[PDB]
Amino acid sequence: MATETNYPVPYRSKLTEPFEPGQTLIIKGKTAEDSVRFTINLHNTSADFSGNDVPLHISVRFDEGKIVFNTFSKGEWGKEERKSNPYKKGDDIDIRIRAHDSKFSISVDQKEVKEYEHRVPLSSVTHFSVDGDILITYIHWGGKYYPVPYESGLAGDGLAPGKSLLIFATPEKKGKRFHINLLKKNGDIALHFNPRFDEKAIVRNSLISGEWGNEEREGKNPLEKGIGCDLEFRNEEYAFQIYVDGERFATYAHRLDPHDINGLQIGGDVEVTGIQMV
Numbered sequence: 001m002a003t004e005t006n007y008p009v010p011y012r013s014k015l016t017e018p019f020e021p022g023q024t025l026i027i028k029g030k031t032a033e034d035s036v037r038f039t040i041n042l043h044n045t046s047a048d049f050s051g052n053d054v055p056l057h058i059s060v061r062f063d064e065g066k067i068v069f070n071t072f073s074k075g076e077w078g079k080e081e082r083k084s085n086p087y088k089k090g091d092d093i094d095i096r097i098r099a100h101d102s103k104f105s106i107s108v109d110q111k112e113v114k115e116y117e118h119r120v121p122l123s124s125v126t127h128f129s130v131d132g133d134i135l136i137t138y139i140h141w142g143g144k145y146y147p148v149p150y151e152s153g154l155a156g157d158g159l160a161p162g163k164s165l166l167i168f169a170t171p172e173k174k175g176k177r178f179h180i181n182l183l184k185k186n187g188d189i190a191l192h193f194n195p196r197f198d199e200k201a202i203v204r205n206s207l208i209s210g211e212w213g214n215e216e217r218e219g220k221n222p223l224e225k226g227i228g229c230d231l232e233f234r235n236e237e238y239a240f241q242i243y244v245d246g247e248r249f250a251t252y253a254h255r256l257d258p259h260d261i262n263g264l265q266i267g268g269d270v271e272v273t274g275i276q277m278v
């Protein structure tokens with residue numbers, strides 16, 4: 001129990017809106033040398049009753065060495081479904097649950113490991129909770145089905161120094177490349193982020209007045225086909241700080257005046273599950 005001051009356990013959160021197909025629930029935290037198990041439940045209740053139906057129960061067991069799924073409804077549990085637990089007592093955990101119309105898709109360390117068919121109505125999930133030997137460090141519920149190629153404007157102030165655009169996506173299993181453009185009203189691309197698996201590199205460049213700039217490579221490429229990633233475009237005074245999965249992958253000196261970056265485009269071989277401005 002280190003610097004908790006965030007989401008203490010047991011954690012109970014009453015959903016403000018229904019959990020719907022296309023939306024993802026992200027839970028990250030830390031465990032200890034003596035953690036034995038922790039749970040994540042998607043459940044029903046009127047507001048705080050706590051104890052009705054549990055559409056989806058997830059038990060990560062360090063003693064058993066697996067992650068176990070099941071549901072509780074009408075006063076009884078069904079048959080558990082198991083998957084290997086890739087975590088050893090002590091490491092950080094990252095479990096994401098995305099709702100779909102026929103099931104829940106669960107990924108561990110951004111790796112899809114389980115498809116749990118709905119046994120009870122998804123619409124009956126009104127609450128969510130986490131408990132056990134885990135120190136929760138991050139919880140987020142949002143997203144939707146983002147079609148790609150994708151295009152949209154950004155809030156009002158857009159992406160300006162001091163702001164960050166976070167994108168959660170998964171390069172397609174058999175994809176070759178995809179890109180993300182941060183644009184200004186006149187169509188110029190301040191930042192072109194273009195991972196190329198065939199080239200084993202991520203190209204960064206700018207499009208000014210219909211002309212592509214220098215083209216910056218350098219950098220191993222921390223992305224993997226079929227594995228989810230967290231992309232952060234941190235706009236600062238002198239450059240874009242590009243973070244991939246928590247670590248800085250590269251810096252990109254501004255070639256265009258920051259501010260007024262109110263456009264976004266995403267294309268290529270990639271699935272997008274979350275977009276947010278912070």
Ligand SMILES: OC[C@H]1O[C@@H](O)[C@H](O)[C@@H](O)[C@@H]1O
Nearest residue numbers: 194203205211212213214215
């Ligand atoms: O115009 C040249 C540019 O074309 C783009 O389609 C490519 O992704 C860039 O790597 C290239 O520098």
